[PDB]
Amino acid sequence: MFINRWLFSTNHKDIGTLYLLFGAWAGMVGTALSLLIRAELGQPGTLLGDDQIYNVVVTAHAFVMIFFMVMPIMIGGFGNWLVPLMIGAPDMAFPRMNNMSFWLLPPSFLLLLASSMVEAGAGTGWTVYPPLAGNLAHAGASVDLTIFSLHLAGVSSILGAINFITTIINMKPPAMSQYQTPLFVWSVMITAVLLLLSLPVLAAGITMLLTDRNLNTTFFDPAGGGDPILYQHLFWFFGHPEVYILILPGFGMISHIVTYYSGKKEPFGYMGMVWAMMSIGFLGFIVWAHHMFTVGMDVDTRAYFTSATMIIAIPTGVKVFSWLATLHGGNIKWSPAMMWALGFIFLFTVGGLTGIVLANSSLDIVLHDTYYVVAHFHYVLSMGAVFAIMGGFVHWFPLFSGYTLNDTWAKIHFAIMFVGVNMTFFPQHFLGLSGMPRRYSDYPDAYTMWNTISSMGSFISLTAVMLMVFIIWEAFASKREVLTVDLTTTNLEWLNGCPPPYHTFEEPTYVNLK
Amino acid sequence: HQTHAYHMVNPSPWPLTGALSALLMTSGLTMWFHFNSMTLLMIGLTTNMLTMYQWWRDVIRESTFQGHHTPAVQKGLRYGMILFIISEVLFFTGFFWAFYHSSLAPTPELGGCWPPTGIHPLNPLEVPLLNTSVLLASGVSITWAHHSLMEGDRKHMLQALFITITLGVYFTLLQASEYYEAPFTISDGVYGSTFFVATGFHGLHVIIGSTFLIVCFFRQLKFHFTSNHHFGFEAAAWYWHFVDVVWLFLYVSIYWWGS
Amino acid sequence: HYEEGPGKNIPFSVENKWRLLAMMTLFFGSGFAAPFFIVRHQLLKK
Amino acid sequence: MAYPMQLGFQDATSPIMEELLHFHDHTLMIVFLISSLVLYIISLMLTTKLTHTSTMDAQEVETIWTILPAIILILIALPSLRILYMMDEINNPSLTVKTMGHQWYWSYEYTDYEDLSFDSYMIPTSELKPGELRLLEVDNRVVLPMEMTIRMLVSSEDVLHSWAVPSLGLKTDAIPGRLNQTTLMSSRPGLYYGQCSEICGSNHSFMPIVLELVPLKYFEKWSASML
Amino acid sequence: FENRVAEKQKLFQEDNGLPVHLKGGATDNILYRVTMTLCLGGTLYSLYCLGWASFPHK
Amino acid sequence: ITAKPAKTPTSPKEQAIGLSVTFLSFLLPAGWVLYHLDNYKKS
Amino acid sequence: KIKNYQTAPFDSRFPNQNQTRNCWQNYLDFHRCEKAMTAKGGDVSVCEWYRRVYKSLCPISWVSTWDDRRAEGTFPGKI
Amino acid sequence: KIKNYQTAPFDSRFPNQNQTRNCWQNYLDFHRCEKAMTAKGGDVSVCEWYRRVYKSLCPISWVSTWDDRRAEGTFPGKI
Amino acid sequence: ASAAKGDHGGTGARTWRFLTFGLALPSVALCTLNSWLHSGHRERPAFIPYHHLRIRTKPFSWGDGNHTFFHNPRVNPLPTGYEK
């Protein structure tokens, strides 16, 4: 029965639980890598070794945080748990294929582990650009294992996307239109469309790198008439959509959290929120070359990409102001999830704004490949995606588990993490403006003070991660079983109790048309 | 028990065996490329085939033999197959992008021209044109099979499907011959790279699509399809038209315009 | 059928909070420790 | 070069770098303003016992928060693109220099008349002369004439690199098989520092760029001295 | 051929509690065990190969 | 949210144990590796 | 000899950051001209402009490799 | 180099019945070559092959019109 | 386009069979004839060891490392030229 239940699952809740466990474990791996980065940089000189071992750490840090922590938690975990419940569906459309999307991830992770253990690792950046990633500058199996790791993660997410789109279009109550589904469901559906379209291009690109490395193709090798920049286009055609994939489920959870703890039955401006997510998803496909403003493209192309990138601020700003307008007039419950969501709104805004700085190709010449970029994306990832994850985890942990957290402990955890991430990343703006490059194991002496402070911040965030593990333990250790929650009339996922039975909605909801 | 129409699937081992088969094929490719051994790769290919065989066998048991494919379930599968074909289109888009990138801006190493110096392309009016008529013809014959099935005509459905499969096999044998006769190779710079990787992934999809049609042929021989309910046949036809359309883009882009 | 309810819908047991603490400590600890030992492995390798 | 506790850009050494400084000041004002408005409005929403929980109409307010950001974006893009097109202008240089990235150092070629070339390696910390800068000095600097429009051509003989000099506003990727062009004009003599800005393997952190800007007559004496 | 689908319908709807991947009878169990043994053995073998490849060799 | 009282309440002493054990499980292995870095960069 | 050459002027055919083709074109133009002026009975001094432009713009290793391949008979451009 | 010119040889670039571009290209080549020479000081003698070919192939009225347009400043080809 | 054919009334099995045997398979037959006319081997070209062709950055994982997967000795030279 244990093997049938946990290895042969066809149940959306159990598969969601597997994803949350997997992503939590991955988050520890990714945290350890981030501390190794910041230990290397925490004083001038060399701690570990040269840039090879250092950038194997950096490369792994990124792949783990993006592919094994954020996407499994948001899409595999919250998505599987919540989407069927929020539409009254009895499971996902392809409940058995869903289980394969999960079980492809431990093999994917194993391949990433193997890449770092064989030879000298893949010290390429998570972008894996040739020729550094090719078979002369990275001879041996490491980069190929990294490519295969991405292939399996890609197949996992493509099949998961097919499952989520089909479920969300086909398995709503017959009276419920698309404009009566909750914003988190919208956010997953749009994320899934972005995955469906972008991951096959990445797959094409890394397959060409594989064949350049092993079958004597020359897609990216000038000696055969190839072009390293073609790889960059193919990678970023996926890689910009990918960052909207990382944030969109977060936006959907933030909408639910802000609505709930404002005591509101609904988010402000529902159709505007749907419009904004669809707009961001669409614009996210036509801006990729803002990752390439120093490669030598023609000036009119740089002007187009500057302009198209900045217009994404418009729909994003509609969401930010609509969250504020959802708070407006609320009976505010200062829960720990609400604290995560408020921190999200402000810190995501700061990071989005430094993204708009970077969108200007002229200024990006000086800022590209510096820590200003690192500061931008850790505000949206370490203080946006992660805050949405933490807010959703503390909000929905009682649903998934049946047990309550200690709210005071969760508030302490939020406070520590807030200090730690801001101490880590805010000084990195100064390091970037003043010219410290990315992917360096050591820096000119002038950069010491802010690197020192940034590394001290990373230890504070480590203390938060450790505290989080204790808090989850304390909840399972004490076994305070949920009785009721507020606002079930507008939060259907709670209405089958905590945790919901293995099978829910065996008798579907009744919704009439009138 | 339930009063919805959706399918609650029995707990299954095939997701796990499929995922493990992926691990074995990828680590197996790694062993083959770097440690001169095909062992793991052969295991992985075998377990992958066993997994697909048993998984789709079970989908047949669930639908033809157990009745779980209600119209709502069928509608979901229709969406699923369309979405899968869309992802496959985007996969090929990456290879077309590579082809146009290289051929519209030929670098000095090629001679600054396309085709590169020293490359002698196949004549697109010879076997490539024949291959084009073969796949176009198989799109007509599969449409005849579809209409025969809908009209209840077992004999002509089987005849038309057999013709469709024969043409797919003919394409595959023509392409295998052309690969062998080609005076350029995958190692002949970016010309050979784009030619063989793009037509090679296409040829793989022809083999997949032909295999799918063959599955449909034997299920039709076994009376699985009704005149109204035959989604495996519809999916294999959609996939077949997709394979035909990719070929037409390859033919116009790589064989003809790129010659 | 499977067991249902709080502490029953999970692949690990919460019947004893100290057994649980050991499990969770092995689980999260092993993930946090793995990068340090891989780095050690690479530094020792050569 | 950067100095301890620096918060902003290195002092501008070229006219284009000064334009970027003023453009950054303009854009950072907007970033600070919007950031602080969002922070303020959050606090405003959270500090009243007054409530309004029934359905709120959104149409009117969404005009304002699409049109106002649209105007702000235009006010950023206008000077942004002005500077972009300024950088691209025909400048008619008096000198062309090539640099080739390598693992892990830069070589330079001055082949307008004489066929001069040389390699430029980081000075190891153990060999620094007293008062010289850790990770930044090189053995052979890029000698160049000040107050003159110079064409720099950038490529690589192995993996990607990127050739950067922050105080001149310069960063041009070094890509094998490709010859990328940028223009260099220093308003002042002196020593101007930069570092490799595309991950390139083991010693990415340790292949700096040092320009040495000198009057034309001194540049000519230096080139003449290489015959 | 003759249409024997009704007899397969009877077989696969038999109330024997078996999951669909085993409902065809003893052949199903054999094929399943072959498949799982190859997967789990090959996975163990792949781990061995990692250990071998993780240290300098040849 | 409302909830039943804890079935198995976790006293402050019990919490100090779980917290210490949790923190040690992160800190000791990494500590051991980092302490021995120099011992690795010579072997 | 209309000279006093300092460096290669702006060429409207090659107005963008990628100057690869500019180096390649002037290298071909020099060598096509130098071949014309040998096989038909003239002076290579007529080819000098292309020579100065490609020498100014082209990486020394590119010139060296192209020269080697012309001598080998493997240069893929038409001269 | 030496002569013995009889008529314009087969040219693989223009293998078909329409020879318009063969006449045009050789006319352009001659006048391009000639401009190149009369500048740098050298000898139009090196241009002679193009001159013989275009004179062989081109209708007199086409040459005459193209010459008139070059003098007028209205010739649309690049020389 | 309407092409130049003409049928409908009802697109059905009979019409698609008619297209299969009356248009599609005749077209295959003609292209097969065309192809078997222009078959027969071209004069293979002089070998020139162009550096953008016969690329070898890593040995192939089969044979002697130096032969492509569908190597044809008659028309595929090695980096050092044609084989004996």
Ligand SMILES: CCCCCCCCCCCCCCCCCC(=O)OCC(COC(=O)CCCCCCCCCCCCCCCCC)OC(=O)CCCCCCCCCCCCCCCCC
């Ligand atoms: C929670 C705390 C954790 C601890 C970690 C820190 C957290 C950050 C809080 C710290 C809150 C600080 C609020 C404004 C900081 C600006 C510091 C500055 O002087 O900036 C200088 C400029 C460049 O300037 C120059 O070119 C020359 C500078 C010197 C001028 C001449 C004066 C000479 C003496 C200098 C004295 C110092 C002046 C400072 C003046 C200070 C005025 C405020 O650098 C930059 O662009 C860096 C910023 C890039 C983009 C971030 C903008 C969004 C922030 C708005 C809300 C804060 C979010 C923080 C995120 C968190 C906020 C809640």
Ligand code: HEA
């Ligand atoms: C969750 C992840 C995430 C998100 C959501 C974003 C969002 C954005 N990003 Fe970012 N980005 C990354 C993750 C992300 N990014 C990563 C990982 C990289 C590095 C890749 C690498 O090289 O490894 C990167 C790199 C990157 C670059 C390349 C810089 C370089 O390498 O030189 C650029 C350039 O344009 C950019 C811009 C933006 C912009 C304009 C947005 C916008 O979507 C932000 C829009 C939001 C707002 C503007 C705030 C809210 C709006 C209002 C309150 C309205 C009013 C505002 C205005 C009028 C301006 N990003």
Ligand code: HEA
């Ligand atoms: C989601 C993505 C993500 C996240 C969260 C982080 C988090 C952190 N990152 Fe990372 N980072 C990247 C993605 C991310 N990073 C990427 C893409 C790059 C560029 C790679 C490249 O150059 O190739 C990068 C690069 C990068 C660099 C630059 C390296 C260089 O240029 O040399 C640095 C340096 O300080 C850094 C530090 C950190 C630190 C200290 C944290 C810390 O804030 C981490 C603190 C811990 C957490 C945030 C908790 C994580 C765990 C969970 C959320 C699970 C919780 C459990 C449950 C809910 C059950 N990162």
Ligand SMILES: CCCCC/C=C\C/C=C\C/C=C\C/C=C\CCCC(=O)O[C@H](COC(=O)CCCCCCCCCCCCCCCCC)COP(=O)(O)OCCN
């Ligand atoms: C009957 C043939 C006719 C149709 C073609 C059918 C089969 C194609 C099969 C697979 C194609 C997939 C990979 C494409 C890789 C290259 C194969 C290209 C097609 C091919 O077969 O190319 C051959 C080379 O094969 C080679 O290198 C070796 C090829 C074998 C090793 C491939 C290993 C790489 C596989 C990587 C796949 C990654 C997939 C990831 C998908 C993830 C999606 C999210 C060409 O032979 P040649 O001798 O160079 O020239 C002919 C000269 N006479």
Ligand SMILES: CCCCCC/C=C\CCCCCCCCCC(=O)O[C@H](COC(=O)CCCCCCCCCCCCCCC)COP(=O)(O)OC[C@@H](O)CO
């Ligand atoms: C470098 C080498 C990398 C190798 C990576 C290999 C990784 C994968 C190993 C794959 C093993 C596959 C085993 C067969 C999977 C069959 C899935 C399938 O067919 O799933 C179906 C749904 O997907 C649908 O339809 C939609 C259509 C079916 C999709 C099947 C796709 C197989 C995956 C191939 C990879 C695709 C990537 C595409 C883009 C490049 C059915 O869903 P179930 O939930 O099962 O049942 C629902 C019941 O109601 C049915 O009665």
Ligand SMILES: CCCCCC/C=C\CCCCCCCCCC(=O)O[C@H](COC(=O)CCCCCCCCCCCCCCC)COP(=O)(O)OC[C@@H](O)CO
């Ligand atoms: C040389 C030998 C090589 C062999 C290699 C083989 C590799 C792939 C094999 C090809 C795919 C075979 C798929 C067979 C699917 C059979 C199951 C099926 O068709 O199942 C049908 C459902 O369709 C469904 O799940 C739809 C199922 C969709 C499957 C789609 C598969 C697409 C291919 C995936 C792999 C892509 C790889 C890409 C690589 C880059 C069942 O429903 P019906 O038909 O309505 O019947 C019910 C009626 O009887 C009621 O009256």
Ligand SMILES: CCCCCCCCCCO[C@@H]1O[C@H](CO)[C@@H](O[C@H]2O[C@H](CO)[C@@H](O)[C@H](O)[C@H]2O)[C@H](O)[C@H]1O
């Ligand atoms: C970036 C994340 C890491 C954050 C930092 C971790 C915080 C410190 C945790 C303590 O770790 C322990 O520290 C001891 C030193 O205090 C080490 O004992 C070592 O030192 C002792 C005395 O010098 C000897 O008794 C021991 O035998 C010898 O192993 C021991 O191995 C190590 O487990």
Ligand SMILES: C[C@H](CCC(=O)O)[C@H]1CC[C@H]2[C@@H]3[C@H](O)C[C@@H]4C[C@H](O)CC[C@]4(C)[C@H]3C[C@H](O)[C@]12C
């Ligand atoms: C970047 C991509 C080329 C990728 C490649 O090198 O492979 C090219 C192909 C088509 C180009 C676009 C088209 O030429 C249309 C537009 C032309 C404008 O001058 C710039 C924006 C513009 C929208 C171009 C942006 C960019 O250069 C595009 C998108």
Ligand SMILES: C[C@H](CCC(=O)O)[C@H]1CC[C@H]2[C@@H]3[C@H](O)C[C@@H]4C[C@H](O)CC[C@]4(C)[C@H]3C[C@H](O)[C@]12C
């Ligand atoms: C028409 C559509 C749906 C209305 C509905 O059926 O409920 C709504 C939803 C969101 C609206 C958009 C958003 O409110 C954002 C923009 C706001 C401007 O005031 C008008 C254009 C603007 C782009 C809006 C146009 C239109 O009214 C949209 C697109």
Ligand code: CUA
């Ligand atoms: Cu060279 Cu980084």
Ligand SMILES: [O-][O-]
């Ligand atoms: O990517 O922003």
Ligand SMILES: [Cu+2]
């Ligand atoms: Cu982007």
Ligand SMILES: [Mg+2]
């Ligand atoms: Mg870069």
Ligand code: NA
């Ligand atoms: Na360091």
Ligand code: NA
């Ligand atoms: Na049908």
